[PDB]
Amino acid sequence: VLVQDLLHPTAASEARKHKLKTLVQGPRSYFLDVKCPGCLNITTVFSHAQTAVTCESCSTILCTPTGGKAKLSEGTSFRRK
Amino acid sequence: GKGKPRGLNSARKLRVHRRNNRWAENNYKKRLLGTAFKSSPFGGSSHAKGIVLEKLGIESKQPNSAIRKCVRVQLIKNGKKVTAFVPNDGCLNFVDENDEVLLAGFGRKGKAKGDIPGVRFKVVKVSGVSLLALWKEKKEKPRS
């Protein structure tokens, strides 16, 4: 304060603020491949559903949406990127 | 920006809004509406001359306590009637009723002068000669 680095802000507190208030804005939403042992085939899913996503060929379930991120369907697993 | 449209094209709004606001300037409202010609006992003229109707003695406003000698005058130009003070000491002596005095303002534009209520005018030239030359001793009152 009175002097700092606007061009180079510490990642420690660049990740506390808002998605639009950062140095150059961007999303806090990740994509993840999601798998259920019912099938041998995984499914790409967005972390904030809105739409209750269904699986591959097994019409079972994957996620039911919420106020933000999607709750996952218990007996499943997931991996980012 | 406190209201006033600052745009490069709002000239009309600004001059109009001017006129509008200008009407709350007393001397301007007066100068346009007429007043000086409508109202006002003179013609808007600097002076006006009339006939003395009766010699008056006005009790003066507070906290002053005396009697201020004036005359009621009926202007020759327009027949309006106006009570006007006679300045200096005496000088209500020089007048008499039924004469021909020349009246002027009291340097206030309307507005009664001192403690003289409702008197906005004064004597400046009675019977033809100046009231001053009469109160000193220069000139003397014409014929009758």
């Binding site: - | 745009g7 094209n9 709002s10 000239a11 600004l14 001059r15």
Partner: protein
């Protein structure tokens, strides 16, 4: 404006003196007269191809384009062979140092050599008085119909 009939008045509609002889066998029927107003205003194809008469037509009539040459937006097309255009402008007021929006509606004669509608920015040239309020004549339709076909429907 005009359209159809051409000969549609109590008096015969003929261009002055432009005589053609019935003895003289013809394929053109009536011999036609035209010119060019000058000032690089290309005398339009429809003026020479035309069949109308208009003696107030700058290209095929007996008037002359001279003086001021102006342009404006078309606000009115109702009166026959004459329209009303609105030239806008800004007036500089020094006291407030600002320009204020103003306009003027010039009445201008339009030859049946044009196809003017309301909106077509247009270029007119001063002439003689031809009427009570007419001192100009349309001499170039700069616009078109303002992308009017662009607003259509489906398929």
């Amino acid at each position: 404006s005009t359209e159809l009939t051409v000969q549609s008045e109590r008096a015969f509609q003929k261009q002055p003196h432009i005589f053609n002889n019935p003895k003289v066998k013809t394929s053109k029927r009536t011999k036609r007269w035209y010119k060019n107003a000058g000032l690089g205003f290309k005398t339009p194809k429809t003026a020479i191809e035309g069949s109308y008469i208009d003696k107030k037509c700058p290209f095929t009539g007996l008037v002359s384009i001279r003086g001021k040459i102006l342009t404006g937006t078309v606000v009115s097309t109702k009166m026959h062979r004459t329209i009303v255009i609105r030239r806008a402008y800004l007036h500089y007021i020094p006291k407030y140092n600002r320009y204020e929006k103003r306009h003027k509606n010039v009445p201008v004669h339009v030859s049946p050599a044009f196809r003017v509608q309301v909106g077509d920015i247009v270029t007119v040239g001063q002439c003689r008085p031809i009427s009570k309020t007419v001192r100009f004549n349309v001499v170039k339709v700069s616009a078109a119909x303002x992308x009017x076909x662009x607003x259509x429907x489906x398929x």
